[PDB]
A paper describes a structure:
The protein product of the Casitas B-lineage lymphoma (c-Cbl) gene is a multi-domain, multi-functional scaffolding protein with E3-ubiquitin ligase activity that is crucial for regulating cell signaling pathways. c-Cbl regulates cell proliferation, differentiation and morphology in response to growth factors, hormones and cytokines, binding to substrates via its tyrosine-kinase binding motif ([name]) in its N-terminus. The c-Cbl [name] domain consists of three tightly-connected domains: a divergent SH2 domain that binds to the phosphorylated tyrosine; a four-helix bundle (4H) which packs against the SH2 domain and completes the phosphotyrosine binding pocket; and a calcium-binding EF-hand, which wedges between the SH2 and 4H domains. Consistent with other studies, our previous study demonstrated that the pSpry2 and pEGFR peptides interact with c-Cbl [name] through (1) a positively-charged pocket into which the phosphorylated tyrosine inserts and establishes the majority of the hydrogen bonds, and (2) a hydrophobic cluster, which forms significant interactions with the conserved C-terminal proline residue of the bound peptide. We also determined the crystal structure of the doubly phosphorylated EGFR and [name] peptides complexed with c-Cbl [name] at 2.2 and 2.1 Å resolutions, respectively, and observed that the phosphate group of the Ser/Thr residue shifts away from the c-Cbl phosphotyrosine binding pocket with minor conformational changes of the peptides in the interacting region.
Recently, it was reported that Sprouty2 is also endogenously phosphorylated on the threonine residue (Thr56) adjacent to the phosphorylated tyrosine in the pY+1 position in growing culture cells. Similar to EGFR, Sprouty2 binds to the c-Cbl [name] domain with high affinity via its phosphorylated c-Cbl binding motif centred on Tyr55. As compared to pSpry2, the double phosphorylation on [name] caused a 12-fold reduction in binding affinity (0.31 µM to 3.83 µM). The phosphate groups of the phosphorylated Thr56 of [name] and the phosphorylated Ser1070 of EGFR are clearly visible in the electron density maps. Surprisingly, unlike the phosphate group of the tyrosine residue, which makes six hydrogen bonding contacts with c-Cbl, the phosphate groups of Thr56 and Ser1070 have no interaction with c-Cbl and are both shifted away from the surface. The peptides in the pSpry2:[name] and ppSpry2:[name] complex structures adopted similar conformations, with comparable overall interactions. This is in agreement with the smaller reduction in binding affinity for between ppSpry2 and pSpry2 measured by SPR, as compared with the greater difference detected between pEGFR and both ppEGFR and tpEGFR. However, we did observe that the interaction of the Thr56 side chain of ppSrpy2 with Gln316, which was present in the pSpry2:[name] complex from our previous study, is absent in the ppSpry2 complex due to re-orientation of the side chain following phosphorylation.
Numbering used by the authors:
A (entry chain A): 50 to 59
B (entry chain B): 55 to 350
Write the structure that this text describes.
């Protein structure tokens, strides 16, 4: 597992 | 042929291990994708032990392996021709390596979607949007793969394409594996991204063709690099296909506190995320431009 950082939207 | 592909894949991997490339570890990462593709091909071959002639005849698999050989040669040849410019981030040859990495990512995702568990399931592939499904079954039945021209003419009968130039923009949007065929998997991805079906190509015209915020083939780190130049302009944003969650959108934006964040809108169509995000003051300046499309 290799992921980029996706976070919660505004 | 399969073993020729492995040696080509092997050569790309060695080319991509060059420390001069300073190759970013984030998806899409060719050093992950190629050995993952190998492992999955290994899996397919193993389930087809004996019945190797069934496999070797499958139309999709034949197109897949042909594209795989062709993409790997094209990547080898890119290093050969680019020489020292491969090391200058921002050089065109380096940008092409990034686009290829994305194409390899889309190829593996498509392979896995068509051969999940290594058994061919293209003919029973379940299309996500019911409207879109019905168009595919009517025009192509249980086919897994159809030529671009043939996809284009069938789509045009239901959703008219404005012009040859738009047809070409459309092709480069839908043909993720860049091989002049449209798979039932690529079709599912496009029709998920640009739903609802009833207005499919007007959606795609508004979100991609005339929208300065859309970034055709851009990775997560490229979005981050591009918004960096707008770090002093909060509300700047761009958006693109997510690589690791194919079928969903990723929006990158600059916050007032000087962060660059990326988010995958859920339970809300892109249209609404973009409009809400405008109104709330987050998504203001598409690719840093002062003027924002009106998507209402």
């Amino acid at each position: 597992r290799n992921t980029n950082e996706y976070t919660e939207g505004p | 042929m399969v073993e020729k592909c492995w040696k080509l894949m092997d050569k790309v991997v060695r080319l991509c291990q060059n420390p001069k490339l300073a190759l970013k570890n984030s998806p899409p990462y060719i050093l992950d994708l190629l050995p993952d593709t190998y492992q999955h091909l290994r899996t397919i071959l193993s389930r087809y032990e004996g019945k190797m002639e069934t496999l070797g005849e499958n139309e999709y698999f034949r197109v897949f392996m042909e594209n795989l050989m062709k993409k790997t040669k094209q990547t080898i040849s890119l290093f050969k021709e680019g020489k020292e410019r491969m090391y200058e981030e921002n050089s065109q040859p380096r940008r092409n390596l990034t686009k290829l990495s994305l194409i390899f990512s889309h190829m593996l995702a498509e392979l896995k979607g068509i051969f999940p568990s290594g058994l061919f399931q293209g003919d029973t592939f379940r299309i996500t949007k019911a409207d879109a499904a019905e168009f595919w079954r009517k025009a192509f039945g249980e086919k897994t793969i159809v030529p671009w021209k043939s996809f284009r003419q069938a789509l045009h009968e239901v959703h008219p394409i404005s012009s040859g130039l738009e047809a070409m923009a459309l092709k480069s949007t839908i043909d993720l594996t860049c091989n002049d065929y449209i798979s039932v998997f690529e079709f599912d991805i496009f029709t998920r991204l640009f739903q609802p079906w009833s207005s499919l190509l007007r959606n795609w015209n508004s979100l991609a063709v005339t929208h300065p915020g859309y970034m055709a083939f851009l990775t997560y780190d490229e979005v981050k690099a591009r918004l960096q130049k707008f770090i002093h302009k909060p509300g700047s944003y761009i958006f693109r296909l997510s690589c690791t969650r194919l079928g969903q959108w990723a929006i990158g934006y600059v916050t007032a506190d000087g962060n660059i964040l990326q988010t995958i809108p859920h339970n809300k169509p892109l249209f609404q995320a973009l409009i809400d995000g405008f109104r709330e003051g987050f998504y203001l300046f598409p690719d840093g431009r002062n003027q924002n499309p009106d998507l209402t």
